[PDB]
Amino acid sequence: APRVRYLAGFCCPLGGLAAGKPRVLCHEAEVFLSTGSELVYVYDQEGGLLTAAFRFPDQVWHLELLAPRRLLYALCARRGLYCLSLDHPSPVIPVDPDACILPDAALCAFTLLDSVLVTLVQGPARWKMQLFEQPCPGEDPRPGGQIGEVELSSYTPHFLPVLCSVSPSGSSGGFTLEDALFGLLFGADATLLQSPVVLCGLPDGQLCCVILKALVTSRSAPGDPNALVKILHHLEEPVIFIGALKTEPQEDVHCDCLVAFGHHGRMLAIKASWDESGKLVPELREYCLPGPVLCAACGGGGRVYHSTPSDLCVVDLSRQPEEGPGGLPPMLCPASLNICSVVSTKLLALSAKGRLMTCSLDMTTESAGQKIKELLSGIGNISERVSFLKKAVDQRNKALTSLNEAMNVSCALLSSGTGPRPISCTTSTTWSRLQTQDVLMATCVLENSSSFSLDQGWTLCIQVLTSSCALDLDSACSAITYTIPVDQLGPGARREVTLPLGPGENGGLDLPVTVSCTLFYSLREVVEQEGVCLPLSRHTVDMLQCLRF
Amino acid sequence: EGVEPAPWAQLEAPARLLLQALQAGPEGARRGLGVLRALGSRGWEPFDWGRLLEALCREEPVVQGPDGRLELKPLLLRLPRICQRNLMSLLMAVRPSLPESGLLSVLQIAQQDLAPDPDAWLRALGELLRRDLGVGTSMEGASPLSERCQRQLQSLCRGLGLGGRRLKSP
Amino acid sequence: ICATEILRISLIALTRKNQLISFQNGTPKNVCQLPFGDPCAVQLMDSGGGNLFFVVSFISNNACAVWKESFQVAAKWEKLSLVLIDDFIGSGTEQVLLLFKDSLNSDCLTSFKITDLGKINYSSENRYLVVPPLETGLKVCFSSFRELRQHLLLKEKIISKSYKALINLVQSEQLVEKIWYRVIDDSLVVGVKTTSSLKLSLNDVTLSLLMDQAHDSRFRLLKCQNRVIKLSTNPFKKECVQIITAVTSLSPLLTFSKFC
Amino acid sequence: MAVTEASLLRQCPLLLPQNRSKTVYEGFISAQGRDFHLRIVLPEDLQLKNARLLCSWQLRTILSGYHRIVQQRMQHSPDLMSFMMELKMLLEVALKNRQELYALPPPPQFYSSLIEEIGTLGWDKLVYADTCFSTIKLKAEDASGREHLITLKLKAKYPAESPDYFVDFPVPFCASWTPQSSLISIYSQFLAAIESLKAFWDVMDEIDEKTWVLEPEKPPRSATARRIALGNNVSINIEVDPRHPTMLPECFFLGADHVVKPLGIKLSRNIHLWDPENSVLQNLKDVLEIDFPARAILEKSDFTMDCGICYAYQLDGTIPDQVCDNSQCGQPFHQICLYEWLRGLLTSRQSFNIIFGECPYCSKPITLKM
Amino acid sequence: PGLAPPHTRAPSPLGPTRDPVATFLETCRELPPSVASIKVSAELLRAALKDGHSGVPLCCATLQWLLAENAAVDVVRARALSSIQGVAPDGANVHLIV
Ligand SMILES: [Zn+2]
Ligand SMILES: [Zn+2]
């Protein structure tokens, strides 16, 4: 009946858990969990009590598991890579450094295949993939000696990289693809050697493939990167998820699709076509979903459960090939990051608050009356929000209309027409009288001829620049400037401003004096530094306009 | 390339059958009646005139006249002219069992107010349906006939000795 | 408190005047007002995609819920033995549970009401044909809400795009270091310090001030007198310092306690 | 205005030019209270023969079935302004046609008030309501004890405008709707029409009881004709006027030319004896001076064995021979009629002497060999 | 402004909606037309307005005399208008009939 159960709770900061690091795993009925802290927890899923907890040092950054060997590999952050027997001869248990294997103390990511281990280790500018044995016989859990290294020369540097293993049919915690897609993406060498491949998605957004058989190296035989590491696709943005899906579903599933995911929501899907010229071609689709994606997973039949800061959503690729647009219904669960999906549909997640939970997707007399009442209350509750948002939309429309009028005025004002029609500003000198001395004033008349209304957001800027030619001694007033707001000017209307130009000190006026008007539009006022000016006229006052007969 | 689908493609199957039948010349209206009895006989005894008379006013685009001119035509003016005339004849036949709200939307199209190259037969069957509802007395010289015909008939009746009956009431 | 970045805290508050205020790094955005008095506490509720509420509880045994995205009382309740916020149902979106007074029975968990303020509402003559219509209506209403939010986001995006379009429509090396302002007595002095690129031998420069019309409801022409200031730096190459300054009156501008 | 400098503002306000040279417009276009995303790039010059025009997938799915028209209009249209006018017009048409998928009522007036009004009626009446709550259907009873339905179709604004009322009975139903009126008002009008038309119903029910009615089967309530059977291989069809049912009907005879003639004669001679105070049967029996059979054959009443195109037997020697390979149709045809029909349809395909197509009545595969 | 000589587009003054110190105080802390008239004898006003300069015997010469000090009296002398709608120093409107 209850589609979501809560199993336990963990320590959240303010906001909630950060993403990338938290991880949920499921074996059969145990669930292994990290929240990006020094701890890793094990919950028996029948009654969601913690069997056991494992204190690592320094921030567990990734986990993986071997069911047959009954081991659990983990990656401490600045220390290396631990292994723990789940038998393991208070429920808290500190990890002894005997369990560390390859303490590389710089490894940022890792994965696992049958008898082989693959790491990925940070350095200076060039990051480097390695490849280790992993002892087939049940022995002291050892790494072994490195089969191979490479240097991902393409990468020159919060977001860890991700690795995914991809095996073909015939030859493991990864994905088994189909022969068509495998041969399309990786080629004939991989197809003939039946070689697993390793996909590393990096924070640059590049998604690189490495064939393993090719990655055998030594001090006498160094790995050539440009030969050995190759680059499928360059997402512009960091990588969250790589996966594969059995679209056309019509444990070992032979996938047909290759999925990747950006932080910002660039999904990418690749499929086999064999279309239109008698040749195998790939169908790419770089979709663009909403949200900063936080986590993702893959469920039965072309479904991809992902999460946002808003909600846990879902996408379907199952059906030219696959799909034109991606439309993505929410499932009405909160922002779970760290999602896992087991098939029987019953997925597990860690809420960004901090909860562990198990999302399980799939008349009466007078209670029907109560039902009608509840439904009406619901619709009445939502409508009062829909109203508010409609009004918000009206205001954003009003903003857009005002801005459109602005751009039209601007284009007319910047244009050449042989007559300054749209908005003009004349100046004209007039001698007046203040107490005893005659003053010289300038009337600046602004006129709108055109239809365009200068609604709120525009302002006149007049500036009267005295005599020019910068001197030995910087003067006491190099310029005076006036600004006035223009409000509801409209078409045919006219505003008028008088300014003094004339001697306040010493009885001395120096000519020519140039009075220059401009208009400034502000983007903010209707709702890098942001505004625009536009250059109306420029009058020079000389002696002949200042004589009086 | 130049294949055109039938404009009744997207309609209810029985309406499709009716409009397929009326296409068939002057025996189109009798065939329309046979069709309606052959749906009284079948599982859906009523026929949804109220749905067909919406579809008859629904508009779609066409490009006619010059090479380029977009115009919006309703169905009634877009389906074949003998289907039109045998329709309006069949609406005369089953007028009493029709909704007036739909009919008037139809007759407004048939009137072809402000059009060049009208259909005189459509306009005349419009007038004859209005007169039968009783909302198109119209206080006009709005008759089925042409002014030409009505004048050439005045011209002849003028050459005949008027009768002692009193039918016009001054 | 709500969130923290690097030090910058975003923060709800509430006060003696029956208010509820926001702050984003000391920036009192989006004030509200509360019906009842003597507030005790706020909790927060999520309710789904974006539908953040603030559930506020009072000393007088009553509470309110204000809907973020519009700091507005979406609901009020009375007599409220208790208020709790959690998922009591199993949906994976928070609800609020409201307990009504023990006058009814000598028991606590009777006389309850559970309300997401949306689709979820629980509490303690055929008519069945009507139901699926109403359920479809609820789902259509919810979908329209979820669609309007996205449409509104898109409008804001387009307005931003077109602001930048204006800016590039009219039109790299920093012509100006930085700005500073002082007040002397009843003058504002604003000054800006130039760089090598701006040559006052070749270029008349001015410095205008523009009032935000949001504050300036009226046609006050604002006037400014401009000086240039060259000072030589330890002449006793050798650095000069040209700066450019503007002086205006204050008292015309502190009518609204403030101006920008 | 005339020039595309203010006319463009006034008729597409939410199209903002990004570039200075007005070549890239972007924003929203309005249609029936709905804004659609749109970006319309021109070349360096003012020519639409080649231009880009991208849309949101909402707008593409809504312009499904007109892509060719829009592409043609891009090449044929002189100016951008007129293209936008045409695009708004086209959007309004597309939406008004697909009004099913695109709508949202104002709940505070609508959903509550309709339930209030149905409670004012009484919940024993209502029988059906659609999941969009657009269609509802109500029931009423005659004093004679007959059920009669009334369908209403409601708009986004039910109380503002009139709701479309669909009712079976044959005379045109007139409902004085006010904005103040409601479902009880129209229901009272419906009962008024019922009690008025009582008499017509009585007549047709008496016929359907006491006669082998032949070719309407399970007749509706709109039907005024009733082809009654009498004797053998002769029938009489009878059309009745609702306002004056008991008055004499337009009546005539089908069957054998040697059997029918005396019946027409006897009708002509006795037609003055009709009296509208008795029943139709009680007048017909003493007019035609005979009695009726009550279902002489109730199973093999009649199967119309005619062309199902021309509705005739004996078209030019030919017989109804070509039939449907279907249990539910079994409709005969003629070679000529069915050939002329199938040669039209798009589904049909012709081999050497064979045409495969859809049966007109049931749309199942039917084969014609000339 | 309406009857003025130039008939040129001048903006309307609309005096301040508030005193600025009053605005300060409000912000920091958060109808029929009135009429008056007089009457006077026509004989008095005639004998006082003698030297009848021009215009209608009464109401127009009366208004000229009421505005004899105003600068825009020549305009009313020409147009011979017995009524006007002036503004004020404080932006308010005032209409004066005789
Ligand atoms: Zn035939
Ligand atoms: Zn058939």
Keywords:
part of a larger assembly, 5 chains, A: 549 residues, mainly beta, six-stranded mixed sheet, five-stranded mixed sheet, 5 helices, 13% helix, C: 260 residues, alpha+beta, four-stranded antiparallel sheet, 1 helix, 16 strands, 15% helix, binds zinc ion, Fanconi anemia group E protein (chain B)
SSE arrangement:
The structure is cut from a larger assembly and holds two copies of chain A, one copy of chain B (170 residues), one copy of chain C (260 residues) and one copy of chain D (370 residues).
Chain A: E1 4-9, E2 23-26, E3 30-34, E4 39-44, E5 50-55, E6 60-66, E7 71-76, E8 82-85, E9 92-94, E10 107-112, E11 116-121, E12 128-133, E13 146-149, E14 162-167, E15 175-177, H1 179-186, H2 188-193, E16 197-201, E17 206-211, H3 225-228, E18 229-234, E19 239-245, E20 254-255, E21 257-262, E22 267-272, E23 282-286, E24 295-296, E25 303-307, E26 312-316, E27 336-342, E28 346-351, E29 355-360, H4 367-414, E30 423-434, E31 437-448, E32 458-465, E33 479-486, E34 494-500, E35 513-521, E36 532-534, E37 538-541, H5 543-546
Parallel strand pairs in A: 5-9, 14-15, 15-20
Antiparallel strand pairs in A: 1-29, 2-3, 3-4, 4-5, 6-7, 7-8, 10-11, 11-12, 12-13, 14-16, 16-17, 17-18, 19-21, 21-22, 22-23, 24-25, 25-26, 27-28, 28-29, 30-31, 31-34, 32-33, 32-35, 35-36, 35-37
Chain B: H1 13-22, H2 28-40, H3 49-55, E1 59-63, E2 70-74, H4 81-93, H5 100-111, H6 120-133, H7 147-157
Antiparallel strand pairs in B: 1-2
Chain D: H1 7-11, E1 15-17, E2 24-30, E3 35-41, E4 52-55, H2 57-62, H3 67-76, H4 80-97, H5 110-121, E5 128-129, E6 135-141, E7 147-153, E8 164-166, H6 183-210, E9 228-230, E10 234-239, E11 250-254, H7 257-270, H8 280-287, H9 335-342, E12 349-350, E13 354-358, E14 365-369
